[PDB]
From Swiss-Prot:
Changing residue 42 to L: In mut3.3; shifts fluorescence lifetime from 3.03 to 1.88 ns. In R10-3; matures to the red-emitting state with excitation and emission maxima at 555 and 585 nm, respectively. Changing residue 62 to L: In RSGFP4; increases fluorescence and shifts the major exitation peak to 489-490 nm. Keywords: Chromophore, Luminescence, Photoprotein. Changing residue 188 to A: In mut1.5; shifts fluorescence lifetime from 3.03 to 2.72 ns. This is Green fluorescent protein. Changing residue 61 to N: In R10-3; matures to the red-emitting state with excitation and emission maxima at 555 and 585 nm, respectively. The keyword Coiled coil does not apply. Changing residue 170 to G: In GFPA; leads to enhanced fluorescence at 37 degrees Celsius. In Venus; leads to yellow fluorescence, improved maturation and reduced environmental sensitivity. Photocytes. Belongs to the GFP family. Contains a chromophore consisting of modified amino acid residues. Maturation of the chromophore requires nothing other than molecular oxygen.
Length: 225
């Protein structure tokens, strides 16, 4: 196809509930799948965010990952978007010794804009833990997202552990269980085992007074040759 040949505008909408605390996040930016780069700004439209921004990074469009040419057949994300009318991204994020997030999102184009609509539910968090107690540093480490084809439902699955730096020098782990499935019936390509290498830098908009997160991200596919 040709849907990701240049810079594409992106829109992210997230509605969540963590331990009863409801909230909403709006994301605006653009992506360039050719170099595997994302640049988006996120705002909490309901006031202050009840959880640390970094815990939402993975939830807040892997179709923008850079897949080297020889791995083009393994780019399930792009394939599903152009042959299956987008895809669904479901995850269970388990924070060690704390609560967990369960997320469902639909990723598809709306006009010339790639949209990621998410519903998030957080349960069993310690009101004084690293999440609700905002004890995580404002940064984000580099991770590898291991992808494999689903064994029974024409889709993929991924597993990886995100490492959140705690302000006391410790690290808060977040195990991710990911599942993707195209929204449409059409034939989408299934990949062989491989992973996505990711780098992310978080920052602030000096002129933004609402709770927010400016984000820069580089993702590259690897594991085959």
């Amino acid at each position: 196809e040709e849907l990701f040949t240049g810079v594409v505008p992106i829109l992210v909408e997230l509605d969540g509930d963590v331990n009863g605390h409801k909230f909403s996040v709006r994301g605006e930016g653009e992506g360039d799948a050719t170099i595997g780069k994302l640049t988006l700004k996120f705002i909490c439209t309901t006031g202050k965010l009840p959880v640390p921004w970094p815990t939402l990074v993975t939830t807040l469009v892997q179709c923008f990952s850079r897949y080297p040419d020889h791995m083009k057949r393994h780019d399930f994300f792009k394939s599903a978007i152009s042959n299956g009318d987008g895809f669904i991204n479901e995850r269970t994020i388990s924070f060690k010794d704390d609560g967990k997030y369960k997320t469902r999102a639909v990723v598809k184009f709306e006009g010339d804009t790639l949209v990621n609509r998410i519903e998030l539910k957080g349960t069993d968090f310690k009101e004084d833990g690293n999440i609700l107690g905002h004890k995580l540093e404002y940064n984000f480490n580099s991770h590898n997202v291991y992808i494999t084809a689903d064994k029974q439902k024409n889709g993929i699955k991924a597993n990886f552990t995100v490492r959140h730096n705690v302000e006391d020098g410790s690290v808060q782990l977040a195990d991710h269980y990911q599942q993707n499935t195209p929204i449409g019936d059409g034939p989408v390509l299934l990949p062989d085992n491989h992973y996505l290498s990711t780098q992310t830098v978080l920052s602030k908009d000096p002129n933004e007074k609402r709770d927010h997160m400016v984000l820069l991200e580089f993702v590259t596919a690897a594991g085959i040759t």
